[PDB]
Write a protein that binds this ligand. Structure first.
Ligand SMILES: *[C@H](C)[C@H]1/C(=C/c2[nH]c(/C=C3N=C(/C=C4\NC(=O)C(CC)=C4C)C(C)=C\3CCC(=O)O)c(CCC(=O)O)c2C)NC(=O)[C@@H]1C
Ligand SMILES: *[C@H](C)[C@H]1/C(=C/c2[nH]c(/C=C3N=C(/C=C4\NC(=O)C(CC)=C4C)C(C)=C\3CCC(=O)O)c(CCC(=O)O)c2C)NC(=O)[C@@H]1C
Ligand SMILES: CCC1=C(C)/C(=C/C2=NC(=C\c3[nH]c(/C=C4\NC(=O)[C@H](C)[C@H]4CC)c(C)c3CCC(=O)O)/C(CCC(=O)O)=C2C)NC1=O
Ligand SMILES: CCC1=C(C)/C(=C/C2=NC(=C\c3[nH]c(/C=C4\NC(=O)[C@H](C)[C@H]4CC)c(C)c3CCC(=O)O)/C(CCC(=O)O)=C2C)NC1=O
Ligand SMILES: CCC1=C(C)/C(=C/C2=NC(=C\c3[nH]c(/C=C4\NC(=O)[C@H](C)[C@H]4CC)c(C)c3CCC(=O)O)/C(CCC(=O)O)=C2C)NC1=O
Ligand SMILES: CCC1=C(C)/C(=C/C2=NC(=C\c3[nH]c(/C=C4\NC(=O)[C@H](C)[C@H]4CC)c(C)c3CCC(=O)O)/C(CCC(=O)O)=C2C)NC1=O
Ligand SMILES: CCC1=C(C)/C(=C/C2=NC(=C\c3[nH]c(/C=C4\NC(=O)[C@H](C)[C@H]4CC)c(C)c3CCC(=O)O)/C(CCC(=O)O)=C2C)NC1=O
Ligand SMILES: CCC1=C(C)/C(=C/C2=NC(=C\c3[nH]c(/C=C4\NC(=O)[C@H](C)[C@H]4CC)c(C)c3CCC(=O)O)/C(CCC(=O)O)=C2C)NC1=O
Ligand SMILES: CCC1=C(C)/C(=C/C2=NC(=C\c3[nH]c(/C=C4\NC(=O)[C@H](C)[C@H]4CC)c(C)c3CCC(=O)O)/C(CCC(=O)O)=C2C)NC1=O
Ligand SMILES: CCC1=C(C)/C(=C/C2=NC(=C\c3[nH]c(/C=C4\NC(=O)[C@H](C)[C@H]4CC)c(C)c3CCC(=O)O)/C(CCC(=O)O)=C2C)NC1=O
Lengths: 161, 96, 160, 65, 160, 161, 160, 161, 160, 161, 160
């Protein structure tokens, strides 16, 4: 739940002392990179229905999985697969705006073995969808913002496998 | 039946009938007295709202309420929430 | 911080952060050096505050110190100064975070269940914060007293 | 200690293809201790409270509820 | 009363009232000529119970008589005997009722609110009530205070 | 729901007087005849499914009202009016112990007038049934308490006709 | 028992026990010697009760002995007298436990669906308990028949 | 539920036209006075319990309803009343930022008029209390914002009476 | 609006306004003179926006202006623009409020039932309101084409 | 739940026999000290909010759990610990009148170990608190019932361990 | 009727009636005259189908005629014919509607709470109406006793 601000003032609360100059320097390291994230979080929010559109066509479409016998065959399953991908963009922008992958341990990595195993979701196609989604996102957002966003995409698929 | 014929008369709605159902002693014996407390928070939340509990702060708001007011306001506070009234309505039997 | 309550208010609506709230985040990060100057002047005079506001609390309520009530000697009066030291510490945390959520999760949830078990008056704690408000706003600048004092009233809404 | 409301509430966001005549004219009986958590539910929905009636005993009786 | 609590419990089971509880109403009515001596003794000492239990309370908590508490002054110590007399004007409503159904609806149900809303700590209010129900037990008999003192000591745990 | 004990408590606190002398003989009148009521209320529960044996069998059983065409001819309208007579006995026995008809106009007489004019229930058949069940209780509790039970039975028939 | 109604009906409001309900506890442990003598005498003549109240029951309702009924032949009437001995044992639990609840749980809450699945009439056993209370209140004292006869009266009044 | 910006929108929509020059003169008038409305919102919500503990002290604490015979000796009835007068402070400060009396209509005024008649409580003592609440709140927030909060106090006061 | 959303979210938790949220309203009110001149940028040039998107809609889809189509004839074409005249009025309400809340309650919650009943294709409207978007942002400035265009792009996806 | 009579009754019910004289001996011992417990239960419910204050200042306050880092440092997490000790004073006083630790078993101590271990709540401080609380109630009720009240406190500390 | 069951089957999902469901109505109209020929065979042969099959019930269950049971020879066995005559009347109501609900709403909905209060075995009614419809299927044909056979068996499974 916490961010780079509320990890510093949580860890400096619990020692009992006030905010000191070793911890304010950690806040200024977040405040120097804060302007980079708000430009990064704006452009993904205007293209959330289009990053998902290209990345499904990057790795998922015209496969076994799109075809019958695969998993995303029925229209009912298909939309869901966009929707079960669209949380992975919205929660990754929240952790990019936070500067901490503490949202991602908390909202979007709880059942993520056990929901997907108890629904017939293949894990190995979701990890292949996400670095197909990371490549089009870092192309859309830039080289500098792409590696900060690239931590929180690779935080998800490492916890998902 | 004195909870029931108020519904057959139309003097109460179904949402008031569910509250006057799950305040009875037969519901209180079956799912409150003979269980652990945070089990019994979760099971009445399982039956009436038709979903499990959402997390921790959604359950800590219920555990202090039965610590102070009792079981009769635990079964109240599930029913007059926004998620009961606007997802089920005031004339539907709840479902999972 | 201001990042957290721009997320948990945007997760309940289940959509992205609109640019109506992203500009306030974008104005927050460029104003980072202003709040550290508020905080360092706040914590730099932590003995000037509590030794002055401890007297102004006891002139507003002399019944904590008179024989019969709560705080006595230099032990039980001293832990009354410990809680005012906590709330002076807890109010400079929300100033740097730019939001009232770090003072919320530590000290704006449940003390009306707590202080009645301790036997202290709840409202006499709140008169200690108003003396703490008038000391720090007199010490701070003319513009930031409307900002640092915009957290001091939130503790009054907690207890009272 | 039951009241007797009558409440006119409209459908705010949805266009319900079932009838739901009863979902616009709750004229139910609500007891006293849980009316006020219930009255704000109609009030936040945009409903109109038409009348309230004391179907139970006398007001001002401070004992026996 | 104990008649009233039994019949609302039997309505919840939707049956007639049980022969276990019908002993108790039968035990209440043979002790209905036992409860009335407690009620008349509090008439003869209501100017004696309250005027002693105030000074018993003010020697226990003299924070009240200090300038700054919620009963300071002769006009303000009027209510700190009058609210105590009002609680002595509650037990005799429920001695002869047997139980706490006039104790709640006149005394208990919002008493955490209004003493906070008047600024008086209830821990001082419950102390003098505890100081009251030591003198009333000494005034009554050993058999009277065996059950009415158990009925006296409900209110202290109910208030705080 | 409140009894005669709480009613004299209700009429004593509200004027600013204490538990005076005149309230005691109202309570002592309750405490004198309260021993009669526990002998009364047990024996009604011995015949609570046997008064309703006699309720139909005196005034309702082999009549023209039960003959097809009348009001009491359906199995959904038969069994709904034995429970509607059984509740009138059970709430009378609460008032038999209350010393007060102030359990009747909260739980019985609240909507009972308009629900019989709307549902086609004849009022005269009920008061020929309820007042017929006054005297069978007079043979079960003795002479005096049936005249006490006849107060609340007439309070039903004053509040039904 | 007496506690089992009181420890549940005050747990559900999450309060401590009201001293009207402590009268109910006090109300008997003074009767526990009187409640124990009667069930010793009921068990001590439990063979004479079933052989007498089983006998003239069939002079009152001769249908269940008759062919076409359930208890045709001695191999089923001795099976029928098991339920008389079970209900006599469930009387003696309820007098000692003090109230309505142990006979309700063990022998009441399925008897409209147990006896319907057995095909036996549910009303005829309800005739037998009124004869089982006829022979029992004929052999005990007069003062306990207003107590021990009323525990019979519950398992009549919820059977039929 | 509306506010003063959308009420100008709604008064222009139901009339029909676009944002005409009369509405912009009304809407710019809201944005000038909207600065003082926030600075008087915080100092009420600071002293929200301190207002209502003094507004009861002007009118209600030594009167007909403290000697036995009125609304508040029964501890639930006084504690409802402090809680009712608490919610007048919340909704008027919700009415102060929103710039309209219509938020008070769909949240307070429609239900409350018929309950207070039916529950036998005096409206004349309530409107004496809110007028006593008006004369303390103008002393706290200053007089110029007291004319703002004097509007929505009177809309409760004229609405209840 | 942001005033309406911040009250209703704070009313449901029975709380006053947070100091993080009060500075949201304070910046929203003071920037209201910025947003009203974006609204008068469109209503000052509304009769050109209708006419250019009138020519731009029937070019990309000519079946609706064709005979048999639902806008055929000089009065039956007059209406489809007048329907587009409503959506200039709706989006001008949305820029002023700073939210799509007047877009909701006035304009978009029933269109999937209305035009199916009226026979006009929703996707025919969804390009005419999209050709409205291309003629509007060419007339606006650089930064507010993201601000006003979010209310345009809300009306595309909620239409189709 | 289960009660000491309804455990003596249920021991002789699953055997199917009648009331044995050893079981009759096992019921007289409950009735001989039943008059002691009924006075013991009122004297704890009088001081039920008082005992927890006298317990938490005996072994928890001014120590290293209500100091930065501990589980009672956050002062709106220490409010959980007061009502956590309100349960163990309430349910132990339930189990004193029950004559039976079966109130504590399937209602309190069934999932109490799994709640505390899933939060990092110190077990060894809770048993440090409850065994400190046992001395306080024995001081207030006397050494007669303090042996009786000390049993069910020790049942709480045994199953939690 | 089968018209009446069809509308509420469609009104629960708020739907116009399915054309496969109107095939069931159109088959019901052209077979409407056949069911009237089924119903007159019952009403014409009523005096041979009631006194015989009731006597089959008394031969299967001779518990009924014997005293101590529900019936007795002079009119109680005669009024158990008219309480059996009502169900044959309800079958003829049910077969001309093509529906179960004329059997339901007149003679099913409260029969258990009726006959417990009347003191008859409800299972003996179910074995009696099983004896009624065993000879009713052999009355008319082998073809028409199957789809009228589907309304015979429901009342057997309604009593138990
Ligand atoms: C002083 C102005 C007022 C006052 C203070 C007082 N407090 C205590 C005891 C405690 N106070 C706390 C409160 C906190 N601890 C925290 O960690 C935080 C947030 C960072 C808060 C708000 C707690 C937990 C205790 C109990 C143990 C402890 O001291 O930590 C006392 C002592 C009471 C006693 O009986 O020992 C006093 C005197 N009381 C007043 O009267 C003043 C109004
Ligand atoms: C206090 C002296 C000790 C302590 C308490 C503490 N408890 C919690 C959290 C919870 N406590 C419970 C308790 C119960 N659940 C039950 O079902 C029963 C039986 C009736 C009991 C007694 C529960 C459910 C919770 C957690 C749910 C929640 O989210 O609140 C906390 C909070 C821990 C946290 O980090 O949030 C604390 C501090 N801890 C101590 O240190 C003392 C030894
Ligand atoms: C963030 C919190 C959260 C989680 C974890 C979540 C998971 C999630 N994924 C699901 C479904 C699904 N998900 C997919 C998955 C995919 N499509 C593909 O082709 C890929 C292989 C894969 C993902 C890229 C399928 C194929 C179904 C099942 C839908 C159904 O059968 O109902 C479902 C069931 C749909 C439903 O709710 O009924 C859930 C709950 N939803 C949430 O809100
Ligand atoms: C099954 C019997 C039954 C019906 C028909 C019924 C109708 C009904 N019509 C309603 C509204 C409405 N009804 C109309 C009606 C019309 N518009 C016009 O201009 C014409 C005059 C008229 C139709 C030709 C309008 C405009 C509304 C919305 C206003 C409102 O919220 O009441 C609502 C309010 C809820 C909602 O739809 O949002 C109900 C419940 N209720 C029932 O129980
Ligand atoms: C606890 C207080 C209380 C009472 C007394 C009460 C009565 C009551 N009787 C009702 C119906 C009924 N009441 C009767 C009454 C009778 N039939 C006769 O033959 C006689 C005239 C009379 C004998 C008692 C009938 C026939 C109906 C059902 C109407 C129908 O058949 O549709 C209904 C409508 C719901 C239903 O039963 O279907 C109520 C609410 N309700 C209560 O809550
Ligand atoms: C603890 C609660 C409880 C009781 C009391 C009880 C009785 C009971 N009655 C039984 C049978 C039976 N019980 C009866 C008894 C009667 N039918 C009548 O007509 C009379 C009204 C009555 C006796 C006078 C009959 C006839 C059977 C045999 C049923 C059959 O053969 O179909 C059986 C199965 C036979 C056996 O195990 O020996 C049990 C267990 N069961 C329980 O679980
Ligand atoms: C019979 C039911 C009943 C209750 C529960 C009750 C509470 C009650 N106490 C009051 C005042 C008060 N009560 C007190 C009593 C106390 N404050 C102290 O400091 C003492 C230590 C303590 C007594 C133990 C005082 C001093 C006031 C007036 C407060 C003030 O004027 O600021 C008032 C306001 C004045 C009035 O109208 O009486 C109420 C309503 N009144 C009732 O009629
Ligand atoms: C937010 C919109 C809103 C309002 C305003 C409101 C009022 C309201 N006032 C009530 C009670 C009450 N209110 C009072 C009020 C007073 N006593 C006095 O002497 C004064 C005249 C006055 C206040 C100082 C009294 C005596 C009662 C109890 C009367 C009863 O029991 O019905 C109740 C019943 C229970 C409850 O408090 O929730 C409601 C619902 N409810 C609402 O939802
Ligand atoms: C502000 C909210 C609002 C909407 C959305 C609205 C729609 C609306 N469009 C209408 C008709 C119409 N609307 C159109 C518009 C169109 N058809 C086309 O072919 C074009 C492609 C398209 C425009 C993009 C036309 C041609 C008619 C008349 C159709 C007829 O009379 O059959 C009508 C019936 C007559 C009337 O205008 O009063 C309504 C109510 N009215 C409203 O108040
Ligand atoms: C169509 C819906 C409907 C039904 C079913 C109905 C039944 C009904 N069956 C009755 C009686 C009866 N029914 C029986 C029946 C039986 N006793 C036995 O031995 C046999 C096992 C059994 C039937 C085969 C007896 C003996 C009575 C008279 C009971 C008495 O007078 O005490 C009575 C009371 C007297 C009468 O008016 O006929 C009714 C009202 N009324 C209805 O409106």
């Amino acid at each position: 739940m916490q961010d780079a601000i509320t990890s510093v003032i949580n860890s400096s609360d619990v020692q009992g002392k006030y905010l000191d100059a070793s911890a304010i320097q950690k806040l200024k390291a977040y405040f120097a990179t804060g302007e980079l994230r708000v430009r990064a979080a704006t452009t993904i929010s205007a293209n959330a229905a289009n990053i998902v559109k290209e990345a499904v066509a990057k790795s998922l479409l015209y496969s076994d999985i799109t075809r019958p016998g695969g998993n995303m065959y029925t229209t009912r399953r298909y939309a869901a697969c966009i929707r079960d991908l669209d949380y992975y963009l919205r929660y990754a922008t929240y952790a990019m705006l936070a500067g901490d992958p503490s949202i991602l341990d908390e909202r979007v990595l709880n059942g993520l073995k056990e929901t997907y195993n108890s629904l017939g979701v293949p894990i190995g196609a979701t990890v292949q969808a996400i670095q197909a989604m990371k490549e089009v996102t870092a192309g859309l957002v830039g080289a500098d913002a792409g590696k900060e966003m690239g931590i929180y995409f690779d935080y998800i698929c490492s916890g998902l496998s | 039946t004195v909870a029931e014929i108020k519904l057959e008369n139309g003097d109460i709605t179904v949402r008031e009938f569910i509250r006057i159902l799950a305040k009875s002693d037969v519901f209180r014996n079956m799912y409150w007295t003979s269980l652990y407390v945070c089990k019994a928070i979760e099971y009445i939340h399982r039956r009436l709202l038709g979903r499990p509990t959402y997390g921790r702060q959604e359950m800590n708001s219920y555990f202090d309420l039965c610590s102070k007011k009792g079981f009769y306001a635990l079964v109240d506070a599930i029913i007059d929430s926004v998620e009961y009234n606007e997802a089920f309505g005031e004339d539907t039997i709840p479902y999972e | 911080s201001i990042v957290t309550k721009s997320i948990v208010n945007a997760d309940a609506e289940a959509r992205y952060l609109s640019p109506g709230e992203l500009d306030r985040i974008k104005s927050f990060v460029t104003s980072g050096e202003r709040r550290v100057r508020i905080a360092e002047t706040m914590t730099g005079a932590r003995e000037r505050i509590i030794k002055e506001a401890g007297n102004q609390l006891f002139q507003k309520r002399p019944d904590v110190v008179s024989p019969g009530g709560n705080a006595y000697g230099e032990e039980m009066t001293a832990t009354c100064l410990r809680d005012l030291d906590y709330y002076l510490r807890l109010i400079t945390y929300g100033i740097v975070a730019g939001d009232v959520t770090p003072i919320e999760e530590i000290g704006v949830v449940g003390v009306r269940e707590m202080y009645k078990s301790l036997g202290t008056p709840i409202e006499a704690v709140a008169e200690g914060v108003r003396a703490m408000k008038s000391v720090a706003t007199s010490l701070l600048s003319g513009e930031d007293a409307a900002e640092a004092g915009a957290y001091f009233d939130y503790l009054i809404g907690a207890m009272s | 200690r039951s009241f007797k409301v009558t409440a006119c509430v409209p459908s705010q966001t949805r266009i319900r293809t079932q009838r739901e005549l009863q979902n616009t004219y709750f004229t139910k009986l609500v007891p006293y201790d849980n009316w006020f958590r219930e009255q704000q539910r109609i009030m936040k929905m945009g409903g109109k409270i038409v009348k309230v009636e004391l179907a139970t005993g006398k007001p001002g009786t401070n004992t026996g509820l």
